[PDB]
Amino acid sequence: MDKKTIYFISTGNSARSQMAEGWGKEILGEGWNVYSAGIETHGVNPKAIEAMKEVDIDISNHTSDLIDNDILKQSDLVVTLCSDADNNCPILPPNVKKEHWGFDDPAGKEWSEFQRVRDEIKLAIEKFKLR
Ligand SMILES: [O-][Cl+3]([O-])([O-])[O-]
Ligand SMILES: [K+]
């Protein structure tokens, strides 16, 4: 069979969606197409790159993409990673297989917060693999 698709969307495509794309590529590897996008495109966060390098995953070559409506409707799973009321949580079309996995925004915080969120995102993806 062909690969299934998981889309990790958020307020931006800088930290949480990028660390999720990173863990998604490594854990869900051969059976899943793992993309990520955001409402805002602020580039790939420097501390998220460094946090993922600490666990031997390279995300420095990821792109900062905007949310494309075609991929939302065609995915097997769309995961919103925003904090359900911060500012700018994604707009989703009907019949789109969605799920909400909330994680705190580490933007502007110390390196330790990127570490904490990285490992919460890891555990979530590891739990997802064995469903
Ligand atoms: O994915 Cl985020 O850049 O919103 O953390
Ligand atoms: K991306």
Curated annotation (Swiss-Prot):
Annotated phenotype, changing R16K: Loss of activity
UniProt key word Iron: no
List of residues binding K(+): N13, S36, T63, D65
Pfam families, per database record: LMWPc
Keyword vocabulary terms for this entry: Arsenical resistance, Cytoplasm, Disulfide bond, Metal-binding, Oxidoreductase, Plasmid, Potassium, Redox-active center
Effect of S17A: 5-fold decrease in catalytic efficiency
Intrachain S-S bonds: S10-C82, C82-C89
Effect of N87V: In strain: SW18, SW4, SW24 and SW1
Disruption of the gene: reported phenotype: Deletion of the gene leads to a complete loss of arsenate resistance, but does not affect arsenite or antimony resistance.
Induction and repression of expression: Induced by arsenate [As(V)], arsenite [As(III)], and antimonite [Sb(III)].
Annotated effect of mutating I91S: In strain: SW4, SW24 and SW1
Family: Belongs to the low molecular weight phosphotyrosine protein phosphatase family. Thioredoxin-coupled ArsC subfamily.
Entry-linked HAMAP family: Arsenate_reduct
PANTHER family for this protein: ARSENATE REDUCTASE (PTHR43428:SF1)
Protein's recorded name: Arsenate reductase
Source organism of this protein record: Staphylococcus aureus
